[PDB]
Amino acid sequence: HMQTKIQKYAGIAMPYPNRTDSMTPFYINHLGRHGARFPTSRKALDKVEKVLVSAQQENGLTSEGMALLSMIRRLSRLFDGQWGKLSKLGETEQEGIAGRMIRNYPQLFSNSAKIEAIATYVPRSINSMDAFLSCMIRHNPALQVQRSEGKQYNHILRFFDLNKSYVNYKEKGDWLPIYKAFVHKKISPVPIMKKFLLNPEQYLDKEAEEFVMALFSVAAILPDTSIPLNLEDLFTLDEWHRYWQTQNLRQYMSKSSAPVGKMLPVAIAWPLLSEFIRSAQEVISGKSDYQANFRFAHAETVIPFVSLMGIEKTDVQVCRPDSVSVYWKDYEISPMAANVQWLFYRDRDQRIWVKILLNEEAAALPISTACFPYYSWEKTRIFFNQRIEMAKKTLSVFN
């Protein structure tokens, strides 16, 4: 499908994908990114507008270029005061995830079931939590609910802000030269810019690539805003594919298991994996009587968490940057409203099984099971504990 690949090429700006309803679990352990949101930064919009205005001043625009400039000035007005907010689409995404959970596992959330939800201090994540919880409560007002949020959860939901080596890597690390070299190889600006600008070949490579990247960025976020305007047809399938490859590599190297990061971006997630294991263990032991723990955070929470779990292919360490896109796909991991759900079951012989859902689809671990997608919890916990120990060892290589 051409249209489906185009949406996937928004990468971690892809809206949550379409999903469908349909033994019973006794506990659900959840992490969810906020839902679809407005752009967080005006920088890409400003860069597009400045290039076009400067071109208009030297007779450099085509007719389509002038139409684009007017659209860009309108988006600047519509985005004002909205930056980074959860959109109406992001609310409905959360209602959809909660609603499907309820219809799939009605017994777990029936009667006076207890649920806890936490979120970061970031409003779009808090609003996502509330869209989710409001759906849950509307379906069953007899739910018992604990809701909290804030900086007190930084250690498990914003670990990427707290590790100094990782912040330095993200801001100044060795992945940047590789990404910039890859953009230069991959982005072919002249055919895009020819749509809007006379003499596109008179632009320096660097400015042409930056213009095109910024335009792609504006077009990629627009479907997340619920504004009835569309730029994605500003670009062909191949053009979107090339852009996506560059942004995919950016996410992989800066946030996941790329060799150049030496697993530092993944290792920092170990406190959340530890906290997942503890909340499950406490529910199993009776220390907790929650039927579910929900957590609302960010793509930089989800991506390293998923890699640290070792969900197959997501922790791949691809040596050759040009090959990353074949083996690791950001839109499969952390689209808008991305979420991970561990579903725990007790079979009739009382053994505990766990099923992992990544964006509501069963995910594989590199351990054996006689009944995929269900894994032994004892086996899975031992595996996760090994991952956590590996993460602590990795972090020991960095002060």
Name beta bridge partners: 361: 358
**Strand 339-346, strand 292-297: pairing:** unpaired
Give dist(CA 392, CA 399) in Å, integer. Answer: 11
Give dist(CA 93, CA 80) in Å, integer. Answer: 23
Give dist(CA 14, CA 37) in Å, integer. Answer: 11
Backbone dihedral angles phi then psi of residue 296, each to the nearest 5 degrees:
-120, 120
Technique behind the model: X-ray
CA 308-220-235 angle, to 5 degrees, is 125
Tokens of 129: 């939590």
E strands, the chain, are 27-33, 114-119, 144-149, 292-297, 339-346, 352-358, 361-362, 375-376
30, 292 in Cβ contact below 8 A? yes
Give dist(CA 132, CA 233) in Å, integer. Answer: 32
Backbone dihedral angles phi then psi of residue 70, each to the nearest 5 degrees:
-65, -40
Give dist(CA 133, CA 139) in Å, integer. Answer: 10
Instruction: Spell out a b/e string for 75-101, using b for 16 or more CB atoms within 10 Å of the CB, else e.
Output: beeebeeeeebbbebbbbbbbbbbbeb
Range of the domain at 271: 2-396
70 by DSSP, 3-state: which?
helix
228 by DSSP, 3-state: which?
coil
Number of domains in the chain: 1
Whether cis (ω within 30° of 0) applies to the bond prior to 373 is: yes
Give dist(CA 93, CA 28) in Å, integer. Answer: 19
* DSSP states of 322-368: GGHHHH--HHHH-STT-EEEEEEEE-TT--EEEEEEETTEE---SS-
What is the domain-level CATH number for residue 23?
3.40.50.1240
Q: How far lies 252's CA from each of 9, 170, 175, 247, in Å? A: 15, 12, 10, 9
Instruction: Spell out a b/e string for 376-397, using b for 16 or more CB atoms within 10 Å of the CB, else e.
Output: bbeebbebbeebbebbeebbee
Q: How far lies 223's CA from each of 8, 14, 183, 219, 312, in Å? A: 12, 8, 24, 8, 29
Fill in the DSSP letter of residue 202.
G
Give dist(CA 137, CA 146) in Å, integer. Answer: 12
